[PDB]
């Protein structure tokens, strides 16, 4: 249990300040998909904002990290939540934190498929990142489980992203 004990800004969802921020240069060559597992899927915007605060609190206060570990969160409201954001060194996938966008789809996606507004938000965030130059045009799309011993992002979500553009073995 790693994460619990339109594009919204960190201030939109009530984020605490990061303890510290480290940047990396250049478009990210990797996009790494996660699920939260806990907390659960969130359908209202205020519930998704609370999930982002709860994950941030677990990461900062219990794991002692600088900030929520992920670059971005996706809610069941179909909104994108800024975590550390583009070109900020993450805390979601060791050896890939300084070279990836880590996207968490809030919820447990081991057996259930995220609803379509969540899959669309994640695809749109990546396309946006590519267009604006934050994500390398030859990026590789991975699930967390491809680079670390974990079930993340869940079997069902991992099978879904296996079908997406730039999915890489
Ligand atoms: C769900 C899910 O996958 N949750 C994520 C947040 C998770 O727990 N992933 C950890 C990430 C652990 C992590 O990356 N921690 C940072 C800790 C960073 C602490 C501090 N430097 C910070 O930036 O907050 C780290 O090890 N970084 C090193 C230097 C690396 O990139 O190789 C894992 O895969 O074990
Ligand atoms: Zn993960």
Author numbering: 3 to 7, 14 to 177
Original authors' sentences:
The analysis of these results, including the first structure of a catalytic PGRP associated with TCT, highlighted the dynamic role of the residue Y78 in the amidase activity. In this structure elucidated to 1.80 Å resolution, the ligand is buried in a mostly positively charged pocket. Whereas the tetra-peptide is well defined, the carbohydrate moiety of TCT is not visible in the electron density. The absence of the electron density for the carbohydrate moiety of the TCT in the PGRP-LBPA/PC complexed structure is most probably due to its high flexibility. There are two possible pockets that can accept the sugar moiety of the ligand (annotated P1 and P2 in Figure 3A). The second pocket (P2) could accommodate the sugar moiety of the TCT. The specificity of the PGRP-LBPA/PC to the PGN is ensured by the recognition of the meso-DAP residue, interacting via hydrogen bonds with R92. The structure obtained here also shows another interesting interaction with a fourth coordination of Zn2+ made with the oxygen from the amide group of the TCT, which highlights the important role of Zn2+ in the enzymatic reaction. This interaction would increase the electrophilic character of the carbonyl group of the amide function where the amidase activity is occurring. By comparing the apo and complexed PGRP-LBPA/PC_Y78F structures, the C-terminal symmetry-related molecule is filling the binding pocket of the peptide moiety from the PGN attesting the non-physiological nature of this interaction.
